[model samples]
Target chain A: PTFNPELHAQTLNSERAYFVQPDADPAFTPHIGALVEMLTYARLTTLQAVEGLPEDQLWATAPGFANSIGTLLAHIAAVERVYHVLSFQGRDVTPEDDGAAYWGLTMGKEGTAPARLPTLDELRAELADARAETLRVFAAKDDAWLAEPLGPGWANQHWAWFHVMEDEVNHRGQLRLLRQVLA
Target chain B: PTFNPELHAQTLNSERAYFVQPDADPAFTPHIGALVEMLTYARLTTLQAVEGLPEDQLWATAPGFANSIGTLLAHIAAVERVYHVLSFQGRDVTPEDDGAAYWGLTMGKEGTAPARLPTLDELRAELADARAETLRVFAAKDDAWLAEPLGPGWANQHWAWFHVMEDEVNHRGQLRLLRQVLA
Candidate 1:
C-alpha cells in the first residue's frame, strides 16, 4: 500500500511545553527538584500521546504489532509501580504491587489482546496515582540517597528513577505511532 | 495484517544497560556530568534501535505510515543538528544549519519517500558526527552556562539539551514499532 499524506492534528500538536521549571516542593535539593521536573514531563507527554484516542482503538491491536495502546498504557503504569516498589521500598515486584497488570504485558506476553482493558481515563488515573507515590518517595530522599545503590548491579536510586522516565518516553513514542496506524 | 509474535531479536535485546554512569567528564560539574551521561544513553539507545535493520527495510515505509526508518533516522539527526546550532551557537535554525535536510520532511512534507536516503551506516555517521559536536559543546559548558537562557521563552541551555534527548527518546519508540511493521 502506498503511503498517503494524512497529517493527524492531534499527533502534530507540538505547541505543548517541552520543558517545565523544577520546583523545590518543600526543601528539595537541586537534583531532587530536577528529577521531579523530568518526571512531570514524562507523565505529561505520555498522556498527551493518547489524548482523544477512542476506547476501541485504545485497546485494539495496531496492524502488525502485538500490543494494543491500552496494553502499553497498562504496562507503563505497572512498570512504574514495580520500579517504585523496587527502588523506593527496596523489594521485588510482588502481586500486590501489580494491580495494573503490567507484568502480563511484558515483551513475550504481549501477543494477544486481553478480554478487558482500561479506558484512557482509568489509565490516566493509574499513572497519576503511581506518579504521586513516586513523588512521595523522592520527596523523602536527599541527594545522597539518590546516589546510593538500590540492589546488586543496580547503580543507584537516581538510575532507577531515570529508567522509569526512559521507559515512559519509549512507550509514549509507541503510543504516538500506534495512533497513526489504527484503522 | 495480523500481528506477529516472532519478535525481532535485535529489538528485544533488553540486556543492554538503559542508563550509563554519570561522570565528571573532563572538567564537567555535577549537573553537566549528569547531562553528559543522559545524552550518552540517548545516542546509544538510538543506535541500538537500528542495530540489525537491513538497508532496504531502513528506507522502506512501514505499512500505513509515511515515514521510513531512514527518514526518521534523518529527522533525528536533522532535529539535533538544528537544535545544536540554536541552543549552543545562539542562532536560529537556518537553511545552512539543516545539513541533514530536516526541512524536506517537516510534517506536511513527509508524504512521499525521499528520492535519496541515507543507508544505516550513513545515518549512523551523520548522528555520530553531530553528537561529537554536541559533546564538545556540552563539555565546554559549565553549570552557570547550563542555567542561562538560549533565547526568548526558552528555559535555559540545560532544558534545551534535555529537550534534544527527550525528542530522541520519543522517536526511538517509533523506530522500534516500525521494525515490527515492516513486511
Candidate 2:
C-alpha cells in the first residue's frame, strides 16, 4: 500500500492530528511496530520536505554548506542499508565487504559515495527499498530480541536500527534549510 | 547519572560505534525501552548541537530562519508536555486548562508563548521535567498498551510520542545550521 502523509499530517499540525489505522501498518512486535510507526512519520515528513525539489536542486547546497539535498537523501538510504547489513546479516561493513561501497556514502569524511548523484525519484525508490527491507527483517523479530547486544561494544540491534531513523531525521532538518535557501 | 554522548558515539561513526549499556538506560518494556532509547539519543544530540551556544545565541535565528535555537528548544519541551497531557493525563490542553499557556510556545503561530524566553539551562530543566514525566508514565505501561489510539482522529499514543522525538530531531538539524552560521 502507498504511504499516506495525511494520516500523519496530525504530527505537524496538532489541530487535525489523529490516528486512524496508520498508512504504514507495521504488523510486527509491539516494540518494533512503534519503532516503525515513528520511522514512517519521519520518512513521510522527509519525503514531503523534498517533494517538489528539482534535480538540479538535488545537488545544490546553500552557500557555505557542505551537503546538497541529494547527499542528504543518499545518506539517508545508505545509513538504512548499512544498519540492515549490520543488524540482520550479522556482518560489519569493511572496505572489502560484499556491499562495502554503500558504507562510504554518507556525509563527513567517511564513505566514498557514487560519483553520480540520485534524482528525487531515484532517492524515493532507494528509500523504499531500504525501508521495505528493514520492515521485513523487523517483522521476524520479537521484543526480547531488541535487548540483545550486537557486533561491537554495548550496541544492540535495537540501537543500530533506531540510529538509522535518527540519522534521517537529522538530515531532514538540513534538507529543510537546503530547500528554503534555494527558494 | 548524566546522559553521556560517548556511549552513543558509535551511531554517527560506524567505525567506532557500539552501545555500552546505553547512557540513558531505557529499562521499561521492550517497545517503550526502544522508544526511550531513540528519544535519549535525540535529546542528547539536541543538547550537543546547542552545547557551546551562549544564552544570547539561544535566541539567535539564522539570517533567514524563523526559529531561534531557544524557540526550537522551548517548542521541543512544549510538544513533549502536550503529549504528556494528551496521553497520560487523559486530558486535552485548552486555553482554559491547567498549563494551557504552554500550548502556544512553538515556532509557528499557535500558542501564546510567554513574553520572556528560556535560557539554555531553563530549557534543559524544562526538557528534563518533560522527559522524566514521560518516562514515568511509560514505565507503567506494557507493549500492548502502545496500540491504544489517543484523542482526536486516527492517532495513537505510540505515534503521538514518536512525533515528540521526531520533532526534536527535525529541529536539531536546523540547530546544526544555526550553529555553523554562528561560527
Candidate 3:
C-alpha cells in the first residue's frame, strides 16, 4: 500500500513522526522493544499456520478473482523490497534479481515476466546479506537521520523505513490467514 | 508454543485482559474470506522464498530459536483448528476437514511430527469449504451467543474469535519476512 505523504506531513515538525529513537532514554526502550518484538513474533507465527499444504495448492486461485496465492506472494515481496529501497534512500534492486518482473508471472499473465521461488538456503543467504547491508549502511545513522525527510530533494527518510516495517508485518499476517484457509 | 495457564492467570482482572480482544471481530461478519486469502498468499510467499533449496532447509533452525518454518506452519494449522473446536461450543470436526489445517500439511514436518503439504487441488477444495462453512456458521450465529462471555472461566468467546483472526493475519506477515530474509 502506498503511503499518503500529506497525512504525516503535519507531524514532520514534531517528535510523533519518528519511531525507535535511542536517545528517548532507557525508559522508552521497553515499549519500543515490546512493539518491535510483537512484529517479530508475528513473523514466526505466520509460518506456523502454513506448514502442511500441498505445493500445487500454493498456486490455487478462486474463480473470478484476479489474484492467486502466488501473485499475492510476489506482491508481498515486491512491496517490501520497494518500500525498503525508499526507506533507505536507495534505488530499486529488482532489475538485477528480476524480482519485480515476477509480479505478472504470478498473476498468470501469458508471456509475463520471469519469476522463481528462492530456496530456503537462498532465503537464508539473502537475509544474511540484507541484515549485513542494512547495518553497514545505517551504522552512521542517529536519531537525527530517522526524522529527516526522504526522497531526493525531499525532507526525511525515517518515516518511510519505520512505516514500511509496520506495513510488512501487518500484511504478512493477512497472507498467513489466507494460507491457513487454503490448507 | 504452549499456552501458560498459570501465567495467564495473572491477567484475570487486569486492563490487559480486555485488550486481549485483539484476535477476533465478534462485532463483524466473522469474515472468513479474509482468512482464506491470507493463507493462500502466505504459502506462495514462503515457497518462493525457499526455491531450489533442500527440503531439510525448511526445518533448519538458528541457535536460541525453538521453532522453524516447518514447526511454525504446523503450529498455525493446529492452533487454528483447536480454536475452531473451542469456538464451536465443543463441536467435533476432523483436522482433515478443517481447511486451515491443510496449510499446515503442505510443507510436511521433517523431524518428529512429519506433516505434509496437500496437493494444489486439495488445498483449493479446502479453501472453498472453509469459506462456505465460515459464511454459513457466521450467518447462523446469534449475536447474543457471541456476546455472552465465555463465563469468567476464561475470556469472551467473541474476544477469543477476534484473537484468532488477528493472530493469524499478523503471523502471515512474519512468514513472508522470514521467507524474504531466508531467500
- Local error of candidate 1 at residue B141 (angstroms): 1.2
**Candidate 3 ranges with C-alpha deviation above 4 Å:** A1-39, A63-66, A91-112, A115-140, A153-156, B1-183
Per-model TM-score versus the true fold? 0.82, 0.79, 0.35
* Per-residue C-alpha lDDT of model 2 across residues B5-49, encoded as one tens digit per residue: 343342534533333232244446545555666677788778888
Residue B74 in model 2: shift from native, Å?
0.8
Q: lDDT-based ranking, best first?
A: 2, 1, 3
Evaluate chain B of model 2: give its TM-score.
Answer: 0.80
Q: Model 1 residue A10 lDDT?
A: 24
Q: Give the Å error, residue A162, model 1.
A: 1.0
Q: Give the runs in model 2 whose Cα sits over 4 Å from its true position.
A: A1-27, A96-104, A108-115, B1-27, B95-104, B108-110
Q: What 10-residue stretch in candidate 1 chain B is worst by lDDT?
A: B1-10
Which CAPRI quality tier does the interface of model 2 achieve?
A: acceptable
lDDT of 2: 0.68
Q: Write candidate 1's Cα lDDT for A1-183 as tens digits.
A: 111112111222433244433332454556766666677677767887787887778767756567888778888877787787678767765444544344543742633334665578987898888877776666567788877777544456777777788878988887777787784
True contacts kept of 1: 0.42
Q: Candidate 2 chain A, which ten residues in sequence have the lowest lDDT sum?
A: A15-24
Candidate scoring better on DockQ of 1 and 2 = 2
Residue pairs in candidate 1 whose N, alpha carbon or C atoms collide under 3 angstroms:
none
Residue B100 lDDT in model 3? 47
